Amino acid sequence: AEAQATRGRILGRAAEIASEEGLDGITIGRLAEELEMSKSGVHKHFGTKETLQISTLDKAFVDFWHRVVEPALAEPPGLRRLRAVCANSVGYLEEPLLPGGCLLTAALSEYDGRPGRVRDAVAEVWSRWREQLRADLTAAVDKGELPAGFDVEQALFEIVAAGLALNAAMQLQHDRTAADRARRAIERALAQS
Amino acid sequence: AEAQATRGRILGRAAEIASEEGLDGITIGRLAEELEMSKSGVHKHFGTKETLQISTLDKAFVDFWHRVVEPALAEPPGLRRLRAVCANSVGYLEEPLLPGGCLLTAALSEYDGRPGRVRDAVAEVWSRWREQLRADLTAAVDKGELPAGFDVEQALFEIVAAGLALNAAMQLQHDRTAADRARRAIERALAQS
Ligand SMILES: [Ca+2]
Numbered sequence: 001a002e003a004q005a006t007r008g009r010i011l012g013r014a015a016e017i018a019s020e021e022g023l024d025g026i027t028i029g030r031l032a033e034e035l036e037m038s039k040s041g042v043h044k045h046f047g048t049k050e051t052l053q054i055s056t057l058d059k060a061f062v063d064f065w066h067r068v069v070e071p072a073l074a075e076p077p078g079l080r081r082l083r084a085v086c087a088n089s090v091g092y093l094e095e096p097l098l099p100g101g102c103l104l105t106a107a108l109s110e111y112d113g114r115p116g117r118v119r120d121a122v123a124e125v126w127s128r129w130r131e132q133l134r135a136d137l138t139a140a141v142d143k144g145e146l147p148a149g150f151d152v153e154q155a156l157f158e159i160v161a162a163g164l165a166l167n168a169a170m171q172l173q174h175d176r177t178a179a180d181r182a183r184r185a186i187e188r189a190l191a192q193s
Numbered sequence: 194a195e196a197q198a199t200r201g202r203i204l205g206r207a208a209e210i211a212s213e214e215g216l217d218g219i220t221i222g223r224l225a226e227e228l229e230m231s232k233s234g235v236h237k238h239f240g241t242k243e244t245l246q247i248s249t250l251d252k253a254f255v256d257f258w259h260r261v262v263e264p265a266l267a268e269p270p271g272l273r274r275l276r277a278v279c280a281n282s283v284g285y286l287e288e289p290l291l292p293g294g295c296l297l298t299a300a301l302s303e304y305d306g307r308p309g310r311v312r313d314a315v316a317e318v319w320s321r322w323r324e325q326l327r328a329d330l331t332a333a334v335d336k337g338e339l340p341a342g343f344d345v346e347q348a349l350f351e352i353v354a355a356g357l358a359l360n361a362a363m364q365l366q367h368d369r370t371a372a373d374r375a376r377r378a379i380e381r382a383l384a385q386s
C-alpha cells in the first residue's frame with residue numbers, strides 16, 4: 001500500500017501547480033508528465049480531473065488546518081483560541097506551504113463564476129473555515145470576553161477580509177508590511193464589531 | 194471609423210467572458226467565434242492575445258472609473274470624496290457591470306502567480322485604484338478631517354480588504370448582506386486607522 005505515498009505525491013505536486021496556475025491547470029495528463037508516471041497510474045488514484053481537482057483542494061485544506069487550527073486547540077474556545085488561530089493564519093499567509101500562496105483563496109476567485117462540482121467543494125471548504133472563526137467569536141461573547149451586543153458577523157467579515165487582502169498583497173506585491181496591517185485589522189475587528 | 198465601435202464590441206464581450214472564465218479564457222479565436230467575426234477582423238484590432246487581454250483589463254477599469262470615481266469628483270478631496278468613492282464602489286460590487294463581478298479583483302488572483310505582461314498591467318491598475326483611495330485619506334488628514342496621527346495605510350488596507358471580501362461573498366455566496374458589512378467596515382476603517 002505504497003499507493004498512499006503515491007497519492008500524496010500526486011496531490012502534493014498538484015497543489016503546488018494549482019497555487020500558481022489555478023485548479024483548472026490540473027489534469028491527469030499534466031500530473032503524469034510532472035511525476036514521470038503513466039496516465040494509467042494517475043487514473044487509478046483519481047478517475048477524472050474533477051475528482052483530482054477536488055482531492056487537491058481537500059489536501060491543501062487538510063495541510064492548512066493542521067498548521068493553523070490544530071495548534072490553536074491547545075487554547076480554550078473564545079478569544080484565546082481565536083487569537084491563536086488568527087496568528088497562525090497570518091503566519092501561513094506570509095510564509096505559504098505552496099509557491100502561489102493560499103490555494104483556498106485563489107480557488108475562491110477561480111470558481112465563483114464556474115458553477116459545478118469544484119465550486120461546490122470550494123464553497124464547502126470556505127464554509128468550514130468561516131465556521132471555525134465564528135464559533136470562537138460566539139464562544140467569546142458567551143463567556144463574556146466580548147460585550148453582550150457584539151456583532152459576530154461584522155467581526156467575521158473583517159477578519160476574513162484581512163486574510164484576503166494579506167494574500168493579495170503577498171502574492172501580487174510581495175508586500176511584507178501587509179502582515180502587520182492584517183494583525184492590526186484583526187485586533188480592530190475584535191474592538192467593536 | 195466604425196472600427197471604434199467594433200473595438201468596443203470586442204472588448205465589451207471579452208470583459209463579460211473574462212469576468213467568469215478568467216483573462217486567460219481570452220483568445221483572438223474565442224472572440225472571433227463569439228462575435229461571428231473572422232480571426233483576421235479581430236487581429237487587426239489586437240495583434241496578440243496578450244494585447245487583447247491587457248486592452249480588456251484596461252477597458253473594464255475605464256468603465257469602473259467612470260461609474261465609481263468620476264461621480265465622486267463632484268465632492269471636495271478628503272472624507273467627502275472618499276465616502277462618495279466608497280459608496281459607489283460598494284454599489285458597483287453589489288450590482289456589477291459584468292456577470293462574474295469585478296474583473297480587476299479576479300485578475301488579481303489569476304495573475305499574481307503568473308509573472309509577465311498581463312500581471313504587470315494588473316499591478317498597474319490596482320496601484321491607481323489604491324492611490325485614488327490613499328489621496329483622499331491623505332487629503333482628509335491634511336484638512337484636519339481625520340486626527341493628525343491617523344494611519345493612512347492601515348485604513349487603506351482595511352478599505353481594500355472590505356472590497357475584496359464583498360466581491361467574494363457576492364460572487365461565491367450571492368450574499369447580499371455583505372454590502373452592509375462592507376459599508377460598516379469602511380466606516381470603522383475611518384474611526385481609528
Ligand atoms: Ca456551530
Ligand SMILES: [Ca+2]
Pocket residue numbers: 324328
Ligand atoms: Ca499622489
